Amino acid sequence: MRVKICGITRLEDALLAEALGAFALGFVLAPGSRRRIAPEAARAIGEALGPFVVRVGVFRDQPPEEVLRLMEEARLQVAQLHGEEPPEWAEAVGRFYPVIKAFPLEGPARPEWADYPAQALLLDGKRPGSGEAYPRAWAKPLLATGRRVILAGGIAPENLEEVLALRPYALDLASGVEEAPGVKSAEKLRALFARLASLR
Amino acid sequence: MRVKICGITRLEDALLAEALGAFALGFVLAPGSRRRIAPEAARAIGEALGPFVVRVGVFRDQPPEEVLRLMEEARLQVAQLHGEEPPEWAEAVGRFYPVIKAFPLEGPARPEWADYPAQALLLDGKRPGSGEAYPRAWAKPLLATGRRVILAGGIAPENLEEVLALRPYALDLASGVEEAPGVKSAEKLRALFARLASLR
Structure with a gap:
C-alpha cells in the first residue's frame, strides 16, 4: 500500500519516513497550519532526500500565482490544494x-x-489535521467512481485492516505517527510500516 | 527496496509498473537510444499516472539547456544523465x-x-541499454561511501538476491522486464514484484 507522510518539518522525520518506504512526503506551506514550514526550509530538506520519493506541497486558498511560485521556491513536485480552491x-x-x-x-x-x-482525491475527516477519524464506509461513494482515492483522517497502525480493506490508491498519515503535531515518532512509523508488510 | 522501471514507451506498461509498486518510471529522451520516447508522449502518459510515482527523464550528452527544455516539455521530475556529462x-x-x-x-x-x-549515482554495465550484467561486488567501493547508489545493468527477477544483498538505495530495471526494447512484459513485471515481496 502506498503511504504518504504529511506535515514534515524536520530532516530527521523526512529521512526516517523515506527509509521506511514512504512514497511521498508532505510539506505544508499553508499560512496558519499546526505543521507549517518555511519554503526555503522544505527545499533544504529536499536536497537531502533521494530522487525516488515524491515531494508534495500543501496549500490552502492560495492563488495559482502564489502556489506555483511557492512550489518552485521549495522545489516541490506535487501540489495539494487543501483549501476550497476553484x-x-x-x-x-x-x-x-x-x-x-x-x-x-x-x-x-x-x-x-x-x-x-485532480490526479488524486483525498478523503479527510471533519477538521483538517485534527486527528479526528471517521467511519470507514464514508469513502464508498467516491471509491466507487474508480478515481484514485487517498484515504486520510486519523489513520494509524492500529486500525489499518479497516482502510486497507477498501484497497484505495494510497493511505495518508500524520497524527497516527506523531508524538506531537509536526513531530514524528520513530516507533510509531516503524510499527506502521511493520504492520503493512505483515498484512501483505 | 525501491524500484525504477526505465524505458517506458507505452501507457499500458507505465500503468502496470505503477500498479505493481514501482517508485519511479524512466522516459528516455536521448536521441540514438532504442527505448526513446517523444516528450509529448511522456507528458500524455504522465497525465494518466497517480501523483505518487516519480517521473524520470533519461538523457545522454545533452547540454543543460536541452535537458531543462525536455524536462519541461515532458513534465518530468528527475533528470537522469546517462552520458559523460561534466x-x-x-x-x-x-x-x-x-x-x-x-x-x-x-x-x-x-x-x-x-x-x-547528483542526488544518486547509478551503476550500469559497460554498455548502457545492452542488458548486460556485471560482477555485483564491483559496487562495494561506491556503496561503501554511504551515498545513495542505484544498481542497474541487466538486473532481472532471477538475479535479485545478489543485488538485494548489497542493500543499495534502489534497483533500476529495463531489459530484465522487457519482451523487446521499450516494450515491457506483463509476465516479467509481475514476476519481478512478486519475487521482491517474497524476498522482503
Missing part, C-alpha cells in the same frame, strides 16, 4: 504539477467530486 | 531538478564518484 485554479496549477484535491467528510462523499480535476 | 552540467540541471548520474562499470566502482554532484 477547479479553475486547480487547472492552472495542474498545468505544471500533478494536483491532489482535499475534501472534508462530514458524512458520505458526493461522487461528483470524482469530477474535480 | 559536474558543471549536473549542477546546472540540479538547480531545478534532482539529478541522477550514471557510471558505466568496466571494473570496480571509483569511490571518488561520490564527489559527483
Whole structure:
C-alpha cells in the first residue's frame, strides 16, 4: 500500500519516513497550519532526500500565482490544494504539477467530486489535521467512481485492516505517527510500516 | 527496496509498473537510444499516472539547456544523465531538478564518484541499454561511501538476491522486464514484484 507522510518539518522525520518506504512526503506551506514550514526550509530538506520519493506541497486558498511560485521556491513536485480552491485554479496549477484535491467528510462523499480535476482525491475527516477519524464506509461513494482515492483522517497502525480493506490508491498519515503535531515518532512509523508488510 | 522501471514507451506498461509498486518510471529522451520516447508522449502518459510515482527523464550528452527544455516539455521530475556529462552540467540541471548520474562499470566502482554532484549515482554495465550484467561486488567501493547508489545493468527477477544483498538505495530495471526494447512484459513485471515481496 502506498503511504504518504504529511506535515514534515524536520530532516530527521523526512529521512526516517523515506527509509521506511514512504512514497511521498508532505510539506505544508499553508499560512496558519499546526505543521507549517518555511519554503526555503522544505527545499533544504529536499536536497537531502533521494530522487525516488515524491515531494508534495500543501496549500490552502492560495492563488495559482502564489502556489506555483511557492512550489518552485521549495522545489516541490506535487501540489495539494487543501483549501476550497476553484477547479479553475486547480487547472492552472495542474498545468505544471500533478494536483491532489482535499475534501472534508462530514458524512458520505458526493461522487461528483470524482469530477474535480485532480490526479488524486483525498478523503479527510471533519477538521483538517485534527486527528479526528471517521467511519470507514464514508469513502464508498467516491471509491466507487474508480478515481484514485487517498484515504486520510486519523489513520494509524492500529486500525489499518479497516482502510486497507477498501484497497484505495494510497493511505495518508500524520497524527497516527506523531508524538506531537509536526513531530514524528520513530516507533510509531516503524510499527506502521511493520504492520503493512505483515498484512501483505 | 525501491524500484525504477526505465524505458517506458507505452501507457499500458507505465500503468502496470505503477500498479505493481514501482517508485519511479524512466522516459528516455536521448536521441540514438532504442527505448526513446517523444516528450509529448511522456507528458500524455504522465497525465494518466497517480501523483505518487516519480517521473524520470533519461538523457545522454545533452547540454543543460536541452535537458531543462525536455524536462519541461515532458513534465518530468528527475533528470537522469546517462552520458559523460561534466559536474558543471549536473549542477546546472540540479538547480531545478534532482539529478541522477550514471557510471558505466568496466571494473570496480571509483569511490571518488561520490564527489559527483547528483542526488544518486547509478551503476550500469559497460554498455548502457545492452542488458548486460556485471560482477555485483564491483559496487562495494561506491556503496561503501554511504551515498545513495542505484544498481542497474541487466538486473532481472532471477538475479535479485545478489543485488538485494548489497542493500543499495534502489534497483533500476529495463531489459530484465522487457519482451523487446521499450516494450515491457506483463509476465516479467509481475514476476519481478512478486519475487521482491517474497524476498522482503
